[PDB]
Amino acid sequence: SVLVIAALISVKLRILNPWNSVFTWTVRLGGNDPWYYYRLIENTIHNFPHRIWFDPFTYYPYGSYTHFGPFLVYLGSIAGIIFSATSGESLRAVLAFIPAIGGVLAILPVYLLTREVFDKRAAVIAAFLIAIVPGQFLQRSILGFNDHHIWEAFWQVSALGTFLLAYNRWKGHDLTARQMAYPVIAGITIGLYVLSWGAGFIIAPIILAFMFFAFVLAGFVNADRKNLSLVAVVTFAVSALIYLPFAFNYPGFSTIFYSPFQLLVLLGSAVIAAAFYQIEKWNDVGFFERVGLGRKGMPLAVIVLTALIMGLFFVLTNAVLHFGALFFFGMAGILYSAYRFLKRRSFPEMALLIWAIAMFIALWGQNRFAYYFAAVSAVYSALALSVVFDKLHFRVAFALLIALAAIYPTYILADAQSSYAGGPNKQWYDALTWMRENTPDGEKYDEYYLQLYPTPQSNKEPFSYPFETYGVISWWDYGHWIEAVAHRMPIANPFQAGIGNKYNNVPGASSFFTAENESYAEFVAEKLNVKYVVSDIEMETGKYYAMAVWAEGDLPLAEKYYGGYFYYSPTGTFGYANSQWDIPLNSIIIPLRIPSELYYSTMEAKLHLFDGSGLSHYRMIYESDYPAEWKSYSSQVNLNNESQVLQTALYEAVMRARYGVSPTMGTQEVLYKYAYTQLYEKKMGIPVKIAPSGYVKIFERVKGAVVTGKVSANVTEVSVNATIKTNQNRTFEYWQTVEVKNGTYTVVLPYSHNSDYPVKPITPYHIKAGNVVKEITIYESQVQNGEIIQLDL
Ligand SMILES: [Zn+2]
Numbered sequence: 001s002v003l004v005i006a007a008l009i010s011v012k013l014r015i016l017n018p019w020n021s022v023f024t025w026t027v028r029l030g031g032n033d034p035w036y037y038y039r040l041i042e043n044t045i046h047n048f049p050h051r052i053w054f055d056p057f058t059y060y061p062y063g064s065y066t067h068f069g070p071f072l073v074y075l076g077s078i079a080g081i082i083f084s085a086t087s088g089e090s091l092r093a094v095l096a097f098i099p100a101i102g103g104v105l106a107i108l109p110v111y112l113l114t115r116e117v118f119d120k121r122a123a124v125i126a127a128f129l130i131a132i133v134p135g136q137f138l139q140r141s142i143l144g145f146n147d148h149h150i151w152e153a154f155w156q157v158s159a160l161g162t163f164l165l166a167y168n169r170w171k172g173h174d175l176t177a178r179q180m181a182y183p184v185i186a187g188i189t190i191g192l193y194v195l196s197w198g199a200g201f202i203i204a205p206i207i208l209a210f211m212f213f214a215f216v217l218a219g220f221v222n223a224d225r226k227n228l229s230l231v232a233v234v235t236f237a238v239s240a241l242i243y244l245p246f247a248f249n250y251p252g253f254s255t256i257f258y259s260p261f262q263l264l265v266l267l268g269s270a271v272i273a274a275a276f277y278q279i280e281k282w283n284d285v286g287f288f289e290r291v292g293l294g295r296k297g298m299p300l301a302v303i304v305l306t307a308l309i310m311g312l313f314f315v316l317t318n319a320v321l322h323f324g325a326l327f328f329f330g331m332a333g334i335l336y337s338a339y340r341f342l343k344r345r346s347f348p349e350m351a352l353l354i355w356a357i358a359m360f361i362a363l364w365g366q367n368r369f370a371y372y373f374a375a376v377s378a379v380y381s382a383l384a385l386s387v388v389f390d391k392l393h394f395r396v397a398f399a400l401l402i403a404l405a406a407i408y409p410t411y412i413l414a415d416a417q418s419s420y421a422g423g424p425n426k427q428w429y430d431a432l433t434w435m436r437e438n439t440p441d442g443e444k445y446d447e448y449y450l451q452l453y454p455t456p457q458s459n460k461e462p463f464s465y466p467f468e469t470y471g472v473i474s475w476w477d478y479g480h481w482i483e484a485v486a487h488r489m490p491i492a493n494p495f496q497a498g499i500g501n502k503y504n505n506v507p508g509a510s511s512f513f514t515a516e517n518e519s520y521a522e523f524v525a526e527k528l529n530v531k532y533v534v535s536d537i538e539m540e541t542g543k544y545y546a547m548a549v550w551a552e553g554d555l556p557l558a559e560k561y562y563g564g565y566f567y568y569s570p571t572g573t574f575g576y577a578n579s580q581w582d583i584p585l586n587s588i589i590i591p592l593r594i595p596s597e598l599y600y601s602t603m604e605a606k607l608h609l610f611d612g613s614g615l616s617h618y619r620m621i622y623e624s625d626y627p628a629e630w631k632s633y634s635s636q637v638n639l640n641n642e643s644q645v646l647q648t649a650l651y652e653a654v655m656r657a658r659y660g661v662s663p664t665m666g667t668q669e670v671l672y673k674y675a676y677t678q679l680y681e682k683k684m685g686i687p688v689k690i691a692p693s694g695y696v697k698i699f700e701r702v703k704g705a706v707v708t709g710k711v712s713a714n715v716t717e718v719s720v721n722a723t724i725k726t727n728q729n730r731t732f733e734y735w736q737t738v739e740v741k742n743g744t745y746t747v748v749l750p751y752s753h754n755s756d757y758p759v760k761p762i763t764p765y766h767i768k769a770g771n772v773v774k775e776i777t778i779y780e781s782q783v784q785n786g787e788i789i790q791l792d793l
Pocket residue numbers: 033147148149
């Protein structure tokens with residue numbers, strides 16, 4: 001059968017194509033969210049068959065309710081126990097296959113659905129088209145992307161096809177416990193839908209619209225409305241039963257968390273269906289006839305019924321990239337169906353259109369729900385084809401000249417998009433495994449990670465941890481990796497928890513990294529009890545603007561972190577303009593916006609760009625390898641030679657600038673540093689070498705050894721200096737300069753000479769007060785306890 005060919009094309013696309021992106025230096029799950037499923041499944045396996053509904057290990061120190069549904073958590077736990085892969089690489093490997101299998105198995109609900117609406121010829125082209133559609137639906141259905149989005153699609157389509165299947169038989173009255181199986185199944189698919197995704201109750205209004213229209217159009221649409229209703233009664237009843245055990249895991253009403261709201265929706269829907277059943281009974285008996293409403297009686301009762309329900313609730317080429325030609329060939333199918341039932345007038349066909357339009361109406365312009373169109377574009381293309389085909393069945397091979405216009409360029413994109421997989425890069429993954437091993441209390445974190453936390457009534461106040469804990473602060477993107485790989489507790493989440501802001505002084509990631517002095521940062525860090533900071537080159541460069549926007553509240557305020565551009569004039573002179581409007585026409589402009597003076601004062605710049613130089617309470621403890629392009633350059637470029645580094649960077653920039661693309665991030669950092677030295681570095685300001693650095697850097701928040709004592713006028717400032725060497729055998733200078741008060745000075749130093757960290761100082765501190773210079777060595781305990789040290793100068 002043709003249901004084995006596409007099934008192989010789908011395996012080829014989802015398991016085979018990205019195989020080496022998933023099975024590399026580690027087993028590497030995609031994106032961020034699959035790492036959190038992983039976190040949940042591991043914990044659920046341990047506490048089987050119980051699972052948590054709140055996670056104090058994330059959104060530190062408040063904790064996060066878990067909206068991720070039980071379907072995938074249990075599916076993955078069950079898979080794990082079955083293959084006795086309960087943690088680590090083995091678990092991940094198993095979990096990696098789950099979305100691929102889910103995406104291959106999507107053949108079944110699609111075939112079923114487009115068979116139940118149309119015929120078999122269409123249902124086969126259908127199963128083939130869904131096996132090759134591209135876009136979000138494929139990207140989230142690939143090896144390693146173990147997330148619930150494939151299952152939203154799978155159970156939604158399943159729910160439709162199984163529901164329509166339960167309307168194509170229950171007719172008349174044969175019902176019995178063999179015919180009862182058909183709606184019970186459909187109720188299960190709905191149940192599983194909501195259990196995959198909490199917002200999935202939305203399928204309930206959709207199906208109820210099927211009944212609404214089958215009633216108010218009982219004129220020119222036939223349907224066994226009594227059985228259509230009875231089936232819905234059973235279906236919605238069953239779905240509610242399946243949902244029921246999970247209804248009470250969130251303290252309130254929610255459309256996303258597992259709350260009794262969803263239960264109300266499914267029970268209410270069962271009641272509505274029963275009202276419809278009764279409406280039909282009154283119709284059939286002649287009640288509307290006797291009260292003199294005639295044939296308008298029933299639709300009016302329906303109009304009124306919904307009004308009340310409404311009442312007591314009242315109070316483009318992207319498309320080609322995302323669907324290929326299945327977009328067009330699915331768009332024609334819509335219209336053809338919008339005309340055909342507009343002539344032949346059937347119920348299943350009407351149901352499908354309603355589903356499609358509701359999809360369109362609700363998910364228009366919302367890129368995050370694109371995957372829902374996949375099944376739509378596959379069914380209405382299998383129809384558009386299973387119509388052109390049945391027109392011509394040398395004509396009998398023009399059928400192939402459009403059946404190639406469809407299948408061909410959408411296998412192409414599907415093959416080209418299926419060959420790369422995402423997830424953390426090696427620098428990040430190694431940094432976090434390092435963190436797990438080299439920061440304190442690892443054993444406790446490992447035990448606690450596996451505990452069945454109780455669900456609390458609120459998370460507005462700091463959670464009460466069962467032990468002495470600390471937080472790890474980084475941009476919110478990285479939260480799932482930090483938790484799943486480092487087994488440490490991130491301040492911020494890919495659910496967008498813990499971002500905070502500056503305008504309302506809410507301590508969080510954005511208010512830490514865009515903080516314009518160390519004191520404010522310290523305020524934020526103290527509130528969130530942070531002990532480690534993790535910063536990456538993306539935070540330093542491309543994502544910096546995003547942190548500014550969140551911190552400030554809007555786009556124009558964030559723009560104060562940026563200046564102009566470097567360029568070459570048409571006479572070939574190098575220049576900087578604070579604004580592009582100062583740039584002579586016909587210049588070549590490096591399409592990289594240079595940060596303003598303000599940027600260089602932010603924590604993100606002090607940490608990632610200046611390697612923590614100037615700061616009192618932070619020290620680098622580890623960095624990863626370089627960004628790829630600079631690792632690659634270094635085989636011909638000496639990274640200790642500023643001139644060669646800079647000339648390489650500018651060349652790359654100008655080169656890319658004519659393709660209109662911006663430099664690689666490592667080059668951007670080199671240019672940022674160059675800009676600083678040329679525009680903003682003051683007479684005695686913090687110096688920085690023009691050189692690349694580790695993609696990922698880890699810092700420790702630290703009290704700092706207090707060095708203090710007396711000077712001798714005219715000395716108005718005391719400076720401290722030390723050379724630091726990273727585990728990548730890169731050096732930079734730590735500097736701090738302190739203003740004198742009443743013939744005395746005070747300085748807080750964060751580096752010690754006996755810490756077990758791979759980033760260490762290689763000289764003692766050289767203090768300098770005017771003419772007198774000294775040479776201090778600091779010990780870890782002095783730094784850890786904030787001991788005071790007397791030194792006369
Ligand atoms: Zn997701």
